[PDB]
Design a protein around this ligand. Structure first.
Ligand SMILES: Nc1ncnc2c1ncn2[C@@H]1O[C@H](COP(=O)(O)OP(=O)(O)OP(=O)(O)O)[C@@H](O)[C@H]1O
Ligand SMILES: [Mg+2]
Length: 243
DNA sequence: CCCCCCCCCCCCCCCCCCCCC
């Protein structure tokens, strides 16, 4: 019922099999277009089929409290050929947002979301933002024992893998670059189960030069085939546009 | 792996005549 190529032919030019459970990951520093990419994916997924959409529902989980409905509405109205309030209402009728305040809160939200997931059959995409939102607090609360710094993340990863395997969903996660290492910059620090659960990896970067910005770099790295690709794209009032 | 800063030195080098009872 779900096809990965249709979601994004630009980035997913190799994956053509009907997706029946995948885990992806975004990574990079601040202000490099991760949330804009998520907005573009949601816009591609929730638009009507007449305007070039997918007509399936999206679930969103916000952890860093950085979601902006105004930007999403602006992108939707710019992508639409004709702007009308009722069509925007129809589009937004298939969008859901959840807030979590702590690791246990997120764990219980995951333990509760399966009721909706069995209730709603049209869900095809799942987004978790800022998976590394609670790292320092958990680490400090865990003392010097590593196993006490990893339990909540372990349980959340197990629940996420169970959900994605059971309900045939697509997961999009975001992490933050917090620590360096004594061309890809990546110093893994997450849970071992989460690290081994990843399938695709994408890194984000921004041009240092001030050519009015308008240039972002993305490096796609799939662990299945060890294929490294570089993408260039721009972000405008209508969303993101690939160079 | 984790976060932010310091401070001056030292002297050189001469030119140029005027005016008769
Ligand atoms: N209307 C717009 N036109 C052009 N660029 C825009 C517009 N709106 C936002 N941007 C760009 O969006 C960029 C930030 O993107 P975004 O909010 O997705 O960051 P991010 O990589 O997800 O970072 P973080 O998660 O730390 O917030 C800015 O650098 C800005 O130039
Ligand atoms: Mg962001």
């Amino acid at each position: 019922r779900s096809s990965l190529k249709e979601i994004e032919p630009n980035l997913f030019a190799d994956e053509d099999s009907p997706v029946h459970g995948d885990i992806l990951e975004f990574h990079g520093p601040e202000g490099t277009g991760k949330t804009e990419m998520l907005y573009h994916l949601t816009a591609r997924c929730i638009l009507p089929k007449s305007e070039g959409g997918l007509e399936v529902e999206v679930l969103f989980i916000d952890t860093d409290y950085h979601f902006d409905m105004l930007r999403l509405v602006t992108i939707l109205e710019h992508r639409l050929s004709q702007s009308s309030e009722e069509i925007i209402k129809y589009c937004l009728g298939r969008f859901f947002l959840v807030y979590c305040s702590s690791s246990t809160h997120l764990l219980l939200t995951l333990y509760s979301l399966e009721s909706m997931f069995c209730s709603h059959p049209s869900l095809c995409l799942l987004i978790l933002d800022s998976l590394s939102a609670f790292y320092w607090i958990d680490r400090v609360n865990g003392g010097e024992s590593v196993n006490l710094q990893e339990s909540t993340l372990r349980k959340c990863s197990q629940c996420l893998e169970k959900l994605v395997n059971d309900y045939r969903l697509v997961l999009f996660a975001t992490t933050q670059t917090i620590m360096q290492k004594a061309d890809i910059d990546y110093r893994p620090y997450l849970c071992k189960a989460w690290q081994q659960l990843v399938k695709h990896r994408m890194f984000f970067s921004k041009q240092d030069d001030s050519q009015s910005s308008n240039q972002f770099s993305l490096v796609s790295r799939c662990l299945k085939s060890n294929s490294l690709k570089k993408h260039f794209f721009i972000i405008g009032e209508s969303g993101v546009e690939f160079c």
